[PDB]
Amino acid sequence: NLPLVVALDTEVLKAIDVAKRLKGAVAGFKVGWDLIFEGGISIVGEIARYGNVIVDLKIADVPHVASRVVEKLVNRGACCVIVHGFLHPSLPRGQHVYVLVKMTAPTIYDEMWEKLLNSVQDVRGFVLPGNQPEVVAQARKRIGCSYRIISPGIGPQGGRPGAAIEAGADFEIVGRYVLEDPARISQWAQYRPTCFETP
Amino acid sequence: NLPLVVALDTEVLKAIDVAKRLKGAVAGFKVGWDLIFEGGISIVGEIARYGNVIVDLKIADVPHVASRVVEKLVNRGACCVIVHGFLHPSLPRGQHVYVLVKMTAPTIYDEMWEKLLNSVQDVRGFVLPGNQPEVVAQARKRIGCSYRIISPGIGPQGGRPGAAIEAGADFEIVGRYVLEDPARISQWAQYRPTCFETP
C-alpha cells in the first residue's frame, strides 16, 4: 500500500481500467470533474469498488448547496471530499472533509494559508501543495500529527515524487504522471505516510 | 424577459419542466452540481434548448484542470461559467467568465472583496451577494457599466426581490423561491437590468 492517491482525471473507461489495475496497491483514488461530467455521480460508487475514493470537486458553495453536495457524495461511495478553505467560517467540516488551504498555483491563498491552518479544526485533514515542500513542512510543524496532510503537484507541476511525504505529508496526489504510466507507482515504494496509515 | 436568472438546483425532470415553462420569460438558467450529478454534462445542452445557460460549479481548480472544465462546459452549450475570484492571479478569463468575489455567506472574501474586484479585468462580469445590496452598490460605483453584475441570495437567504437590481445588479439569481412557484417571476416585472440587457 504505497502512500499515493491516484487522481483519475480521465475518461470513465480509462479510470475503471486504472482502478482495477491498481486495486490494493495504492492508498486510494481521487475522482473529480472529468469522471462526473461523463458518468454522473454514479461513477463514484463504481470506482469505490476498487479502493477508497476521495471526491474532489473543490467544493466551494454556500452551506445549503455545499452540505447537500457533500452528503450526496459521502453517502454514494466517497470516503471523503475536498472543500475550499477560503469559505471559512462557512466551511463544511468533520471526518469526511479535507480542506484545501494553499494551491500548487498562485492564488489568494498564498497570503492566507497559515491563518487558515490556525482557524480550521475538526476536519479530516488539509490539502497542501506538494510542489512547495517548505509549505508542507511548516504546516506539519504547526499542526503536528493532529490531522492528515495530502499533497498534489507531483510531476508536471514541479514536485518530485516523495518530496512532499519527506516534508511531512501523509499521501501524495498524482494524476498525469501515473496515468501516463501506472508502473511509476513503484517510485513511492520506499516512502511511508508521516502521521496516518490511511487517507 | 425579466432580469432574472433561475437557479435550477433540482432534479433533471423538474429542471426541464421549469425551463420549458420559463422559456422566453427570464434572462437565463443557472445549472449546477445537482443536475450534472444526475445527468452528466449532457444536461447542460438539454437546458440550453430553453435559454441562456450559466454553468455554476464554483470553478476553483488549478489552470490545467480549470481550462479543460470550462472548455467542456462551453462546448456543451454553456453561454458562460462562474469561477472563484480567490484563484487570482490563476483565474480563467474572457467573455465566458463570471467571477465570484464575495458570497451571500461569510467567507474570507469579506475582508478583501473590493481589492479583488479592482484586480480582476477582462472577464464578462462579477457575482456579488444580492442579500447585501450595499455591496452591489459599492461594486457598481467602482466598475460602472464596464462589467455585468449578477446577484444571488434572494428569498430564503434574506434578499428581497429587485433590491440587488435596484442597487446596481444586472440580474438576480433566484433558486428555491422561484422553483417553489414559477409564477413568482412576475415580481421582477417592474425591474430592469442596470447596465446590460442580457447576462
Ligand SMILES: O=c1cc(O)n([C@@H]2O[C@H](COP(=O)(O)O)[C@@H](O)[C@H]2O)c(=O)[nH]1
Ligand atoms: O492545489 C492543488 C489542489 C489540487 O486538488 N490539485 C489537484 O491535483 C491533481 C494534480 O494533477 P496532476 O498530478 O496531473 O498535476 C488534479 O486533479 C488537481 O485538480 C492540484 O493540482 N493542485
Ligand SMILES: O=c1cc(O)n([C@@H]2O[C@H](COP(=O)(O)O)[C@@H](O)[C@H]2O)c(=O)[nH]1
Ligand atoms: O454567494 C453566492 C454565490 C452563488 O452562486 N450562490 C448560488 O445562488 C443560488 C441561490 O439559491 P437560492 O435562491 O435557492 O438561495 C444557489 O445556486 C447558490 O449556489 C449563492 O447562493 N450565493
Ligand code: NI
Ligand atoms: Ni478519505
Ligand code: NI
Ligand atoms: Ni452568460
